[PDB]
Design an enzyme around this catalytic site. Structure first.
Site, PDB file in Angstrom:
ATOM      1  N   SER A  23     -19.597  43.276 112.783  1.00 51.01           N
ATOM      2  CA  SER A  23     -19.809  42.556 111.513  1.00 51.01           C
ATOM      3  C   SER A  23     -19.035  43.252 110.386  1.00 51.01           C
ATOM      4  CB  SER A  23     -21.321  42.447 111.313  1.00 51.01           C
ATOM      5  OG  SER A  23     -21.674  41.329 110.534  1.00 51.01           O
ATOM      6  N   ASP A  32     -19.171  32.427 117.232  1.00 50.27           N
ATOM      7  CA  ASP A  32     -19.671  33.344 116.203  1.00 50.27           C
ATOM      8  C   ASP A  32     -19.472  32.776 114.791  1.00 50.27           C
ATOM      9  OD1 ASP A  32     -20.440  35.557 114.735  1.00 50.27           O
ATOM     10  OD2 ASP A  32     -18.431  36.498 114.965  1.00 50.27           O
TER      11      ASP A  32
END
Ligand SMILES: *[C@@H]1O[C@H](CO)[C@@H](O[C@@H]2O[C@H](CO)[C@@H](O[C@@H]3O[C@H](CO[C@H]4O[C@H](CO[C@H]5O[C@H](CO)[C@@H](O)[C@H](O)[C@@H]5O)[C@@H](O)[C@H](O[C@H]5O[C@H](CO)[C@@H](O)[C@H](O[C@H]6O[C@H](CO)[C@@H](O)[C@H](O)[C@@H]6O)[C@@H]5O)[C@@H]4O)[C@@H](O)[C@H](O[C@H]4O[C@H](CO)[C@@H](O)[C@H](O)[C@@H]4O[C@H]4O[C@H](CO)[C@@H](O)[C@H](O)[C@@H]4O[C@H]4O[C@H](CO)[C@@H](O)[C@H](O)[C@@H]4O)[C@@H]3O)[C@H](O)[C@H]2NC(C)=O)[C@H](O)[C@H]1NC(C)=O
Ligand SMILES: *[C@@H]1O[C@H](CO)[C@@H](O[C@@H]2O[C@H](CO)[C@@H](O)[C@H](O)[C@H]2NC(C)=O)[C@H](O)[C@H]1NC(C)=O
Ligand SMILES: *[C@@H]1O[C@H](CO)[C@@H](O[C@@H]2O[C@H](CO)[C@@H](O)[C@H](O)[C@H]2NC(C)=O)[C@H](O)[C@H]1NC(C)=O
Ligand SMILES: *[C@@H]1O[C@H](CO)[C@@H](O[C@@H]2O[C@H](CO)[C@@H](O)[C@H](O)[C@H]2NC(C)=O)[C@H](O)[C@H]1NC(C)=O
Length: 483
Positions: free
Chosen positions: A137, A416
């Site tokens: 992330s 994602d």
């Protein structure tokens, strides 16, 4: 053997004499091979490091890395989170040193200068030993950007689901969710999201009120703010995983198609239609999601409170709680408004189909930045002083930092929600980065957010296992090149 220590980090790396602040870090030598052996460095990123102890372990990709290369692991808490803030009040003045530039030099300085308890010699600092930076992330974007901006300290890098391209109107956040979602649920969530738009634009005060009451949100004043709750449905997709099973996201899509968990009969590809999907959606929010939502910020006790949703009350505690352990993660909001990353999570433009109302717009989010950060003793946030997404992409290289890379490996996830700001984005010029020997990249088929960092995914899905084995093999081959 393990330990917790404190490193006296520079407040301003370009002015080392404004002084220091204390930054919290943890380490395990469980798999360490002795002086000169590698070190694997990880930061959780935009969050307190409380409860991240598992990243020292081989239940996470970080320990698996250390086991295979016989290195130690260190988890470093990002500045301004947890026990690592230089200030106890976060406003536009004090937050001036929470910068990507400072975060990047935080890691290189740490690796080059920390006096480690398991090795007082210099022989396991980054000048004399190979250090591997790993992150997912934002921490993955931090890993990659360090490779871009300060290349010569760490030996190798692995970045997974890294949003390396800063984007202002980031409606593409919901594009992979549209793709991986069931067809019937996708079309029907589009229908409800586009209906909310038509009621908010061409609709009457009475129609608007009625719609807001279907959700139990009649007391929400701004229609804006009501439209902003509907991604709660699609947002759950980010909580997915190859081991979450029949998870809250899929529970939501069932509620929308009017069926029970193990139903014999279900709708086909076209769904249930607007009048039915509207009611199921509205009933799913009022029944399961709304109760105790605002209460989870700790600022309200009412189980049926509806104050959290009011983004126009400049005195709401979501804005005025300036403590380090605030509930909204205002520290991350500062990066979005100041760096500026933005990443504003919005409905698609007009030509393009959307699963989120178009009322939820970049401007809706931008407006909240001066409420998070009122002007303090002359200081503001950077996007008010004229900075934009090109301020960051100009510096980092954004998507195009892939052009000259050394010993950096990417992982992304097919579905994602952060895919499309990363290196494998379908919107990046030329399409998803092509893998090369010198710069490997792989996409996890059916993948979610950082779906290769938990080993539970390794065993639960054969696609992750291939991806985890290849990159572990690549990190090994690259560290061997240090000797
Ligand atoms: C139209 O609209 C429909 C309604 O919304 C929609 O249907 C829904 O689709 C989604 C997505 O496909 C389904 O979600 C999946 O559910 C799987 C589990 O299904 C079983 O449980 C479901 C939940 O129901 C629970 O109900 C009670 C609750 O107490 C209990 O029974 C129990 O909790 C049940 O779990 C059931 O809904 C489901 O029903 C099946 O079997 C029924 C008979 O028993 C039958 O009635 C059902 O009918 C449906 O399908 C048939 C066609 O076969 C059709 O004719 C029907 O009319 C109806 O559509 C149905 O057949 C089951 O009992 C989950 O496994 C799955 O999660 C996996 O995938 C995601 C995403 O990648 C991951 O997040 C998960 O972690 C998980 O990954 C694991 O598994 C996958 C396998 O693909 C692997 O890829 C992973 O690697 C990982 O594997 C590891 O774990 C596995 C164990 O989890 C191991 O096996 C494996 O080896 C590894 O170790 C996902 O959540 C949703 O259930 C379904 N809803 C309904 C009501 O059917 C339609 O798609 C839509 N159609 C179109 C065209 O748009
Ligand atoms: C993950 O690491 C653990 C140790 O933290 C490994 O478990 C050890 O395995 C060796 C060899 O099988 C034993 O001699 C040790 O006694 C074990 N230690 C403990 C604490 O159980 C484990 O094998 C590793 N997992 C994988 C998949 O490699
Ligand atoms: C890719 O980037 C690296 C890192 O910026 C470049 O390596 C530098 O090259 C200059 C000129 O030879 C040296 O003075 C630096 O010391 C090098 N730094 C590091 C960290 O290696 C490299 O030249 C670039 N490659 C290409 C093809 O542009
Ligand atoms: C904006 O938020 C403030 C703070 O939460 C609200 O003020 C509180 O209001 C409750 C009752 O509504 C009182 O019990 C508190 O004593 C008040 N505290 C403060 C610090 O003001 C205010 O009502 C909100 N404004 C609107 C329009 O809802």
């Amino acid at each position: 053997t393990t330990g917790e220590a404190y490193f006296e980090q520079l407040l301003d790396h370009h002015n080392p004499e404004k002084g220091t602040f204390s930054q919290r870090y943890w380490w395990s030598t469980e798999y360490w091979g002795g002086p000169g052996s590698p070190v694997v460095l990880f930061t959780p990123g935009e969050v307190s490091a409380d409860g991240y102890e598992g990243y020292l372990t081989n239940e996470t990709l970080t320990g698996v890395y250390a086991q295979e290369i016989q290195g130690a692991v260190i988890l470093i808490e990002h500045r301004y989170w947890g026990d690592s803030s230089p200030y106890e009040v976060l406003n536009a003045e004090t937050l001036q040193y929470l910068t990507l530039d400072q975060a990047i030099l935080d890691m290189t300085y740490f690796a080059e200068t920390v006096k480690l308890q398991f090795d007082n010699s210099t022989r396991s600092n980054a000048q004399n030993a190979p250090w591997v930076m790993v992150g997912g992330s934002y921490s993955g974007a931090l890993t990659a950007w360090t490779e871009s901006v300060a290349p010569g300290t760490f030996w190798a890098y692995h970045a997974t689901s890294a949003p390396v391209e800063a984007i202002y109107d980031y409606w593409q956040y919901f594009y992979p969710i549209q793709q991986g979602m069931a067809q019937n649920c996708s079309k029907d969530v589009s229908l409800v999201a586009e209906y909310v738009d038509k009621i908010g634009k061409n609709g009457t005060a009475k129609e608007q009120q009625a719609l807001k009451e279907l959700f139990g949100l009649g007391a929400v004043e701004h229609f804006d703010d009501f439209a902003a709750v509907l991604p709660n449905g699609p947002y759950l997709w980010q909580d997915n995983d190859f081991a979450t099973g029949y998870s809250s996201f899929f529970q939501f899509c069932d509620a929308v198609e009017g069926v029970e968990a193990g139903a014999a009969v279900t709708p086909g590809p076209e769904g249930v239609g607007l009048e039915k999907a509207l009611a199921n959606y509205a009933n799913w929010f009022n029944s399961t999601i709304l109760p105790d939502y605002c209460a989870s910020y700790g600022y309200w006790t009412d189980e049926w409170s509806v104050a959290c949703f009011d983004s126009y009350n400049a005195s709401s505690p979501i804005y005025t709680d300036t403590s380090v352990g605030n509930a909204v993660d205002r520290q991350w909001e500062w990066f979005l408004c100041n760096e500026p990353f933005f990443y504003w999570q919005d409905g698609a433009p007009e030509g393009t189909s959307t699963i989120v109302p178009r009322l939820v717009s970049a401007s809706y989010w931008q407006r909240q930045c001066p409420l998070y950060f009122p002007e303090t003793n002359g200081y503001t946030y950077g996007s008010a002083k004229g900075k934009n997404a090109a301020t960051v992409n100009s510096w980092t290289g954004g998507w195009d930092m892939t052009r000259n890379t050394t010993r950096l490996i990417w992982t992304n996830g097919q579905y994602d929600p952060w895919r499309d700001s990363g290196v494998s984005s379908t919107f990046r010029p030329g399409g998803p980065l092509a893998s090369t020997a010198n710069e490997p990249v792989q996409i996890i088929p059916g993948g979610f957010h950082c779906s290769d960092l938990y080993m539970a995914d390794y065993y639960a899905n054969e696609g992750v296992k291939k991806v985890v084995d290849n990159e572990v093999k690549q990190i090994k081959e690259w560290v061997e090149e240090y000797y």
